[PDB]
Copies of this chain bind each other. A is one copy, B any other.
Amino acid sequence: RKERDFHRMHHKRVAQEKNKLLTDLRRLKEHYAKYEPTILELKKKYETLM
């Protein structure tokens, strides 16, 4: 039981850290999907200019 509890908390804390990384990844992805349409619009203006 002692060994089981030790491995339980190691596994759980690792899983929690993985979930935190996933949330951070979501945040950055949203933050830069905000920027991407500006690049697309500049591309359209560039093409029209040529």
Could you list which residues of chain A lie within 8 angstroms of chain B, going by C-beta atoms? 1, 3-4, 6-8, 10-11, 14-15, 17-18, 21-22, 24-25, 28-29, 31-32, 35-36, 38-39, 42-43, 45-46, 49-50
Contact = CB atoms under 8 A, between A and B. Distances in A.
Question: For the complex formed by this chain, how many copies does it contain in all?
Answer: 2
A25 B21 contact: yes
A49 B8 CA distance: 61
25 contacts: A3-B4, A3-B7, A4-B4, A4-B7, A7-B8, A10-B11, A11-B11, A14-B14, A18-B18, A21-B21, A21-B22, A21-B25, A25-B25, A25-B28, A28-B28, A28-B32, A32-B35, A35-B35, A35-B39, A38-B39, A42-B43, A42-B46, A46-B46, A49-B49, A49-B50
